[PDB]
Design a protein. Sequence first.
Lengths: 246, 244
Amino acid sequence: MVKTIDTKTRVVDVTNEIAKKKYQAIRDFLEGEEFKEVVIFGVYLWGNYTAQMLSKYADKVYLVDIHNSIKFLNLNEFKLKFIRGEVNPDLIVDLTGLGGIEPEFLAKFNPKVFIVEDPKGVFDVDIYEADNTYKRTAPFIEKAKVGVLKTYRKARVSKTSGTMTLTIDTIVDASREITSLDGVLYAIPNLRYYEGILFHENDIHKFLSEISQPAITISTLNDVLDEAEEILSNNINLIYSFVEEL
Amino acid sequence: MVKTIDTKTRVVDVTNEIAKKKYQAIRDFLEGEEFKEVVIFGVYLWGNYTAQMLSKYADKVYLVDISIKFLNLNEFKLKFIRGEVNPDLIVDLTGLGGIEPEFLAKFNPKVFIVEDPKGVFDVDIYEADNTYKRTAPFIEKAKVGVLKTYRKARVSKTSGTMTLTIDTIVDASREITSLDGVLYAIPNLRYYEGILFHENDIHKFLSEISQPAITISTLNDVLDEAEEILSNNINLIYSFVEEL
């Protein structure tokens, strides 16, 4: 009588939808401009889609983490490369967010375009004070075209614009909407701290397995698969990303 | 700068507090009466705690699935047709798709307790429920009670321990998210019976159900506040047995 149903949408699919949204904001902001060297600061797992996509508009792309012609470097290899004069990027994209890359390190560079990701979502006094986005933009006001990447959920609460944050809130809200469907007993959001699995337990197998999980597991009296999927889709479509020029 | 905090309360702790609430409701209903030969229907895992605690006011104690004796519905029925079991106390925790009234009609207890699976109103869940057709064959040749469990001024589709666990932890994660300096709050939940009965992975089951209820990304140390949110949501759960 009581059925158990997994959604066909996985967590990685939600994550990809958001990554694609942020990337298209970036691609819209760049117009059709081509670069020789792109440097993207951020964690590999959230930045890889943008790196892979920007590689078609660049001769070389670096992904720098603070951990195919795309190179992956932690921040110290990159600093050694810079001091040696082996890197000088015309495009810089900072996706680090809260407690991320330092303004004085950025001030050393001279790109044609700088894009910084604003981590702030709905207002939070502590998150507001910890944010230093505009101190990161300050050193470029006479060096480059500066844009601030913003991502919000339309008329919803999200404390940050982070892909993980948005993923969590999207899937949790969807499980609560699904719960309210006729005949549904409950809806489990299948989520985990993925960065913890990959970067602090170094278990690629477990990471790939938990992130490939069905987004929602539903205990229900009715086949609500299609409705659950469209609910999940509606919440994904609530996410809006754009780059504001300074 | 950005901290990651696991709550000290794990999912099993939530599960045990709900199971405990339901049990205290049941013994409040039994008012210290003692029995010998008790049968408890339900899925073992939700059905346990009640069995071992009822073992102190009883004896032989049976836990039947679809010290304490553990049974498949099959050994229990074969034992009954052969005439080796006749219980004075019956507690039915099977809920929505459980034991049929015609099979219950075969028994002759002094006391009967059935769990009402309905929570907040749902037309299909309401219709699928047949609690009172289960109470019908005893409706006073024996003392009959209905175990009801709700979240005060909150929505839950059933009174199931799994359901209440989920809704409690998810809601707690939403309140914790609203704290100043919190970036996000992950509710660590899993379909445990799927792991245990359908993948036969005791190690994976134990590992998953022992997970911290909530993993928090935050600027501030909010551990105590998170624990208190979680506790407040657990205390919203009210359980009682109504006498017919």
